[PDB]
């Protein structure tokens, strides 16, 4: 909703921060009591974020100080107005000190850039964001051995051993959708699912080949709001013309 | 994992 321009540009100033302003602790105390299991794996994960804001530049102090510009914390932000007055949570809040969990501060350090021969046939962005951009590719020596009129198919789908996992959710299916090779470098949309497929906002018919266009958008989980996944397609033209040349 | 589909009304 901001433009990508707009994001950018927020990316750009925060890169800056992170490289020259900014000073970070991670919260030691814990709200809940956790096997040695959990705290554990909550203890990689803080490391992890350590590696990761380190990487952009930023200082991590081991103690909560007058210099600090964020604190992160695994404990419930929402819930820090029930915390004791002594609680270092409770102090930075009333201060106005930034506190992100760490599901914030992993989101921000993606937003951070911080985390063959075989062609690109197409190139798949969710534009609802539940999935990174993922390129589908293709031999240009096995398709063109290949005498059949599908040169090869790429399944979309909720069962993680597909070609492109549409992450867990019940409404989908665990093979939902497939994308075909056609011969000239041609894609074709083959909707296979039990609750449908819609292409450009419309429901296309089960089992049938349906012709891809640059920009199309392939949208699942229609009906509900929160189940909804946009994938837009871009269809890399250089393709067609490695198929020619190698003819 | 792999479960059957929520099928809609």
């Known amino acids: ?247 | 994992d792999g479960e059957s589909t929520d099928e809609d009304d």
């Open chain 1, 1 to 247: 909703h901001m433009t990508p321009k707009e994001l950018l540009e927020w990316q750009t100033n925060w890169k800056k921060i992170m490289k020259r302003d900014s000073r970070i602790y991670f919260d030691i105390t814990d709200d809940v009591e956790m096997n040695t299991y959990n705290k554990s794996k909550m203890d990689k994960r803080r490391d992890l974020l350590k590696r990761g804001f380190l990487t952009l530049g930023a200082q991590i102090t081991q103690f909560f100080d007058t210099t600090v510009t964020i604190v992160i914390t695994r404990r419930s932000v929402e819930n820090i107005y029930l915390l004791k007055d002594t609680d270092i949570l409770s102090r930075a809040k009333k201060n106005y000190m930034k506190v992100w969990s760490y599901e914030k501060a992993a989101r921000f350090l993606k937003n951070l850039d911080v985390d063959i021969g075989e062609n690109i046939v197409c190139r798949v962005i969710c534009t609802t964001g539940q999935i990174p951009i993922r390129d589908l590719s293709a031999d240009i020596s096995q398709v063109l051995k290949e005498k059949r009129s599908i040169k090869k198919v790429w399944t979309f789908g909720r069962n993680p051993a597909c070609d492109y996992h549409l992450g867990n959710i019940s409404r989908l299916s665990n093979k939902h959708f497939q994308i075909l090779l056609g011969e000239d470098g041609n894609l074709l949309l083959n909707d296979i699912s039990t609750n449908g497929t819609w292409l450009n906002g419309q429901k296309v018919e089960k089992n049938s080949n349906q012709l891809l266009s640059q920009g199309d958008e392939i949208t699942v989980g229609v009906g509900v709001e929160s189940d909804i996944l946009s994938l837009v397609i871009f269809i890399n033209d250089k393709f067609k013309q490695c198929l020619e040349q190698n003819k």
